[PDB]
Structure 1
Amino acid sequence: GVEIETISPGDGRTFPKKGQTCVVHYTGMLQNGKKFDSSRDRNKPFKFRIGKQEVIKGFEEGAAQMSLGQRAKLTCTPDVAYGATGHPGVIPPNATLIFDVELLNLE
């Protein structure tokens, strides 16, 4: 399982339900603070669908606690994202995934 340490919430009334867009402007970070991914630089917000099992599930069920406009430094266990194989060439196995996400709109 994951935990979520929030930064700055937004509306708090809305939460991601089934059949919805989910547009995030996230970045990434390995556990030593050595980042590898940031959708903010290429100016294109990541737009993944809910429940379709196309994102890694640590990003998925961790996004369930999010609200609209909420910014939250979450984290991920090794067992929820690339456990013993890793992404080949990019991240080694058995490594946590500290993130930094915020939701734009449309749940």
Structure 2
Amino acid sequence: GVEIETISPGDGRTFPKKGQTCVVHYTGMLQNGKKFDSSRDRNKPFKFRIGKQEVIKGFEEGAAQMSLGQRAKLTCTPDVAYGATGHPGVIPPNATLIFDVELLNLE
């Protein structure tokens, strides 16, 4: 499940398509716990493309429901991120994920 809660401003028309590369300042958060990832540290704003399953599913579908300039707030259920597996050492199994996401894309 993906549940968008948008911090408003953007344009409401510019949506990503297939094979397009988008620029995201993602900022993870575990529920009732501290951070686990950011791109604000590295200042390397994570140019990835759409439809190649490179990111996880819950992060991928939430970028499709955003526009240029928007600043969403994802909430990924465990079944679409790691919840049976668990990333070893960083994300425990059966974990709910939160993502502060800004989309200032190109293309």
Deviations 1:18-77 (A, max 9, x none): 121111011100001410101011111011110011110110011110100000111100
Q: CA deviation at 1:8?
A: 2.5
Q: CA deviation at 1:105?
A: 2.3
Between Structure 1 and Structure 2, the one with more strand by share is 1
Distance in 1, matches of 2:30 and 2:9, equals 24
Structure 2: gaps spanning 5 or more residues: none
Distance in 2, matches of 1:8 and 1:100, equals 13
The answer to whether structure 1 residue 83 and structure 2 residue 83 are counterparts is yes
**Identical-pair percentage:** 100
- Stretches of 4+ moved more than 3 A in 1? none
8 Å CA contact 1:4–1:73 kept in 2: the answer is yes
Distance in 2, matches of 1:24 and 1:98, equals 15
TM-score (norm 1): 0.94
* RMSD (Å), alpha carbons: 1.1
Structure 1: gaps spanning 5 or more residues: none
Q: CA deviation at 1:17?
A: 0.7
Aligned length: 107
Deviations 1:61-106 (A, max 9, x none): 1111010000011110000100211111111111111010011122
